[PDB]
């Protein structure tokens, strides 16, 4: 036994290692696994193909939009001015309090990000027969606010950044839109719950009209798919904008404060009885303070009888939940009974003069 | 360049797929769509009992459903949700006999246990002036989600890869699809560890994209058929004949 | 085909790529499995305690997010109810299979101070989505099972690393409706416990304490098969 | 030309150089880099508690300085009343623009215990000088950003490093009048919450208990831009 004698390290304790941390940090855990080892392993039928990926996820189409063309459209007939962002809308017809809205997936990819940059490639896939002909600008303003939405025609449109498409024979292309921007990424349109348009606008008029064959359809239906293109690219992983549809269930916001519930009826020692949210003593459930008694409106917990009153009053120390003028008319202990709790936090302020 | 010279032969230049003893042509060129890579054999690590294949009858091709489909039907409107290693069965069901009088589902009534990549070609016949668009797209295990009834329509499976079948130019959809699940083996009879859902991969089902579109004279109808080989196959599990129970 | 790209009508030139931020913060984003590996909340919970070895609270281990709890009309979890969702789920929408570990480091409160036991158990399944959330021979401690012991008094908060224990090629992803009665076991990673070892005289003090659970997939995720995105909801129309 | 200098009328010899402190105490003080991230107090509050993700207190990250808040007539906070902005506003005061990081350091009380999780939001914009300081779908914490939980219990102190998320060349510096509507994207690196996980029991525990907040620059600070002083106050005048 050397006695070592020099002075050791001298630093700071912290409770928890690093969360944002993700890619070069060994990260130390108490595995529950029986190697220490051991490494989950994928054999050889268990191939991973899809190496999850930015410009992967982003180099798939898919559609958002679809235009019915109909034949007597004239040549300055707007079909679609859709935003240049990947948050492109598509509403779907429900009746849900939540509308729910389909995006394309380079558009579920960039919401999880801040800022996204780079061209984006819309395929329009026109749906037409060898003997339909059209004739179609699908241009690009960079630039347009909200009140510049407006006035738009084709006229306008030609001055800048313009793909005139001609239906004939072959009947899909792909105009990969420009990110013309003062700023090198761009902030996300929507955020959380709390709202930035796009760069630019895409616009799609009608440059030279339908003309079809007598034996042929009037109409010509365009599928608007939309994709992240070669070049792009997001950065800042923030709060989502987007959330799932596997429960829709949104509960917008007199009741018991917030950790009290479940209570049930009780005593207390400087009290009769009395709600309670726990077994120990002075664990009398606090109540707000009403701006009047109670009446609730379904859960109530179960005494020898329902509690379905209850007179808030402060306690001398909050606000107590009571279900010689005032002792008199309070209720014995007796109707406690089991002490059954009540479901969840549920009340009525029921007010006379 | 583009120098047409049609006769009693017609101009075009025929294409085939030829298989053991099933051959079917298409004037049209596929529009392939492979969701996933070819699959490696899997029978070495759960079966000892004698797997064998049977590329003489079971990659033979096999109609599983026709469907006329006429322009009243709407903008997203289902045609088939087909499960493919299940309709495979229930279609020979529906023509209301044994499964035991095909040639190419034999082994399903013998052994246990099938493992396999499936093809799909959907030939559609639509006449040169119909304007439409479908498109055939394969989703693994269907019936395993429950949000996927919120999720069946054209803008969802435009997302994953997909075939589309356009009625003008009476378009053919090759799709490859192999096998991916979450067991290795999937079961064609009542089994132990499960009894519900039997024998299913997943779902090919057919969307419209955007419906049949003509003139007040045009062809209304336009059939559609849907075919299926079953080329990497193989069994295992020899068992008896009288455990298969009728598919659903 | 899907990303069949016909007639290409560019109008663009080059623009400089940044390497998804490499070039402007010092660090990339091209690959989503490394910002999977941040921690996102799991699941929260409200202790009511109604032994020494009854598990407290129980959770299926999985790396869809689970059945997502907001709460009652009067006290909804503000997260759950208003910011739905995170970052993870987000992404396993987009995807069919995964095969992989998970952490979780839960972070416990820290009025309570008595020991706490976690359990991994890989035995018990998942009888489909409802139910597939935070619960508080299954309902003790048990002897075989992958566990640890955290003190509280040092440090309120347990890492752990699930592994992936399933006879399988990979897992379900999405939500999940008890189809097959095997397929069951196709779910979860396992069924995560934990336990408080306090007294009766000592779990009053602990009643109503949030129990906060993080999660993240941890270098062996692999989400397989391609499955495109389900319908949205935005949450600035949220009222 | 400013820093021209026609005609020197020299009379002194050579002084010799101590190299900035060098020859004396061992160490230099040429860089002015360096003396920036030594940790200057940054803001100040006192807990006024009127859930368990309710964002406890918020503020804009930023090198500036916040909006200096002396306090009401009553009680003044001593040194922000007394002693003006110390340093690194005082050099800032100096450029206009920077492009770099941040620490904090937040020095939390010692009577509370309860685990405490801190946000970072490079969403959120600052509108303006006013309301640029310590405010005690924002409301909540939030999954996907940027997140750090430090255990009061263990030791109540978390050390951060906000880093440059802005889309900019370089953010602005002085004061800030909210000009553009796009600008105001422009001046913080973010926006900080802390909020603590305790129940309403122990929050009144909480309640008046100082919290504060330090800064420093570290390691990627580039101040740009050359902008003159603007008028200063002298601190011993002061009565
Ligand atoms: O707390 C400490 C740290 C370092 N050292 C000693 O100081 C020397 C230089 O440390 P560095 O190099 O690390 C080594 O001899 C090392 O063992 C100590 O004695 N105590």
């Keep these: 036994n ?44 268990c191939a991973p193909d899809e190496d999850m990926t930015v410009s992967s996820i982003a180099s798939r189409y898919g559609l958002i939009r679809r235009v019915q063309w109909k034949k007597d459209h004239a040549k300055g007939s707007l079909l679609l001015q859709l935003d240049a962002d990947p948050f492109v809308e598509q509403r779907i017809e429900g009746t849900n309090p939540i509308s729910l809205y389909w995006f394309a997936p380079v558009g579920v990819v960039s919401s999880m990000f801040m800022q996204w940059r780079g061209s984006l490639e819309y395929r329009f896939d026109i749906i037409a027969s060898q003997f339909h002909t059209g004739r179609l600008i699908v241009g690009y303003v960079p630039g347009l606010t909200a009140s510049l939405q407006l006035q738009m025609d084709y006229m306008k449109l030609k001055s800048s950044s313009y793909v005139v498409f001609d239906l004939q024979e072959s009947n899909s292309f792909t105009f990969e839109v420009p990110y013309v921007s003062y700023r090198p990424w761009w902030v996300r349109k929507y955020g959380g719950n709390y709202s930035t348009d796009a760069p630019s606008t895409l616009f799609m008029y009608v440059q030279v009209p339908l003309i079809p064959m007598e034996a042929v359809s009037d109409t010509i239906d365009i599928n608007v798919y939309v994709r992240g293109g070669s070049s792009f690219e997001v950065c800042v992983p923030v709060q989502p904008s987007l959330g799932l549809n596997w429960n829709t269930d949104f509960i917008l916001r007199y009741r018991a404060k917030t950790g009290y519930a479940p209570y049930y009826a009780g005593v207390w020692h400087s009290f009769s009885l009395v709600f309670r949210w726990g077994s120990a003593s002075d664990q009398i459930a606090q109540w707000p303070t009403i701006s009047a008694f109670l009446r609730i409106k379904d859960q109530a917990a179960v005494g020898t009888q329902p509690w379905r009153t209850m007179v808030v009053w402060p306690s001398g120390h909050y606000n107590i939940g009571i279900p010689e003028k005032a002792k008199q008319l309070f209720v014995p202990a007796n109707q406690q009974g089991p002490g059954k709790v009540s479901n969840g936090n549920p009340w009525e302020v029921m007010r006379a003069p | 360049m583009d120098n047409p010279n049609p006769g009693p032969d017609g101009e075009g230049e025929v294409e085939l797929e030829k298989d053991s003893n099933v051959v079917l042509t298409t004037q049209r060129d596929p529009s392939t769509s492979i969701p996933a890579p070819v699959s490696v054999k899997w029978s070495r690590w759960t079966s000892n009992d004698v797997v064998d294949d049977y590329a003489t009858i079971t990659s033979r091709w096999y109609q599983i459903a026709e469907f006329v489909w006429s322009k009243d039907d709407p903008f997203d409107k289902e045609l088939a949700r087909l499960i493919l290693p299940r309709a495979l069965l229930s279609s020979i069901e529906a023509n209301s006999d044994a499964i035991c009088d095909v040639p190419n589902t034999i082994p399903f009534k013998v052994h246990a246990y099938w493992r396999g990549d499936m093809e799909v070609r959907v030939q559609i016949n639509s006449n040169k002036f119909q304007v439409g668009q479908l498109q055939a797209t394969w989703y693994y295990s269907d019936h395993e989600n429950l949000n996927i009834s919120s ?16 009625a003008s ?20 009879r009542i089994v132990p560890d499960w009894t519900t859902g039997i024998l299913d991969m997943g779902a090919l089902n057919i969307r419209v994209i955007a419906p049949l579109r003509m003139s007040a004279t045009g062809p209304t109808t336009c059939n559609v058929v849907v075919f299926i080989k079953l080329n990497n196959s193989e069994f295992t599990g020899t068992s008896s004949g009288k455990f298969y129970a009728s598919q659903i | 085909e899907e990303s069949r790209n016909t007639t290409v009508l560019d109008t663009t030139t080059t623009l400089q790529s940044s390497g998804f931020g490499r070039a402007f913060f010092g660090e990339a984003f091209n690959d989503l499995k490394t910002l999977m590996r941040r921690y996102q909340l799991y699941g929260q919970l409200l202790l009511s305690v109604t032994d020494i070895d009854h598990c407290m609270f129980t959770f299926p281990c999985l790396p869809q997010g689970l059945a997502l709890d907001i709460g009652s009309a009067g006290s909804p979890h503000e997260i759950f109810n208003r910011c739905r969702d995170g970052i993870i789920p987000l992404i396993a929408s987009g995807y069919r299979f995964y095969r992989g570990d998970l952490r979780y480091k839960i972070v416990f409160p820290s009025n309570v101070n008595s020991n706490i036991w976690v359990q991994h158990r890989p035995d018990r399944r998942l009888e489909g989505w409802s139910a597939a959330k935070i619960v508080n021979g299954q309902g003790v401690y048990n002897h075989g099972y992958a566990s640890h012991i955290q003190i509280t008094r040092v440090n309120n908060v347990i890492e752990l690393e699930v592994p992936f224990y399933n006879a399988t090629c990979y897992n379900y992803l999405q939500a999940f409706n008890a189809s097959s009665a095997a397929s069951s076991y196709a779910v979860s990673l396992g069924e995560i416990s934990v336990g408080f070892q306090a007294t009766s005289d000592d779990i009053a003090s602990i009643v109503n304490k949030p129990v906060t659970i993080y999660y993240s997939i941890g270098d062996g995720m692999q989400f397989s098969q391609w499955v495109g995105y389900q319908p949205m909801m935005i949450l600035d129309q949220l009222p």
Excluded at chain 1, 10 to 29: D, Q, R
Aim: glycine share 6%.
């Design chain 1, 2 to 45: 050397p006695s070592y004698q020099q002075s050791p390290r001298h630093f700071v304790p912290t409770g928890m290692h690093s969360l944002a941390l993700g890619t070069n940090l060994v990260e130390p855990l108490h595995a529950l696994r029986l190697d220490a080892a051991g490494t989950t392993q994928h054999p050889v039928g």
């Design chain 2, 169 to 188: 130019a009476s378009n053919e959809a090759k799709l490859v699809i192999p096998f991916k699940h979450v067991y290795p083996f999937l079961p064609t």
């Design chain 2, 151 to 166: 999720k069946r329509s054209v803008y969802g499976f435009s997302q994953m890869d997909h075939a589309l079948i356009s």
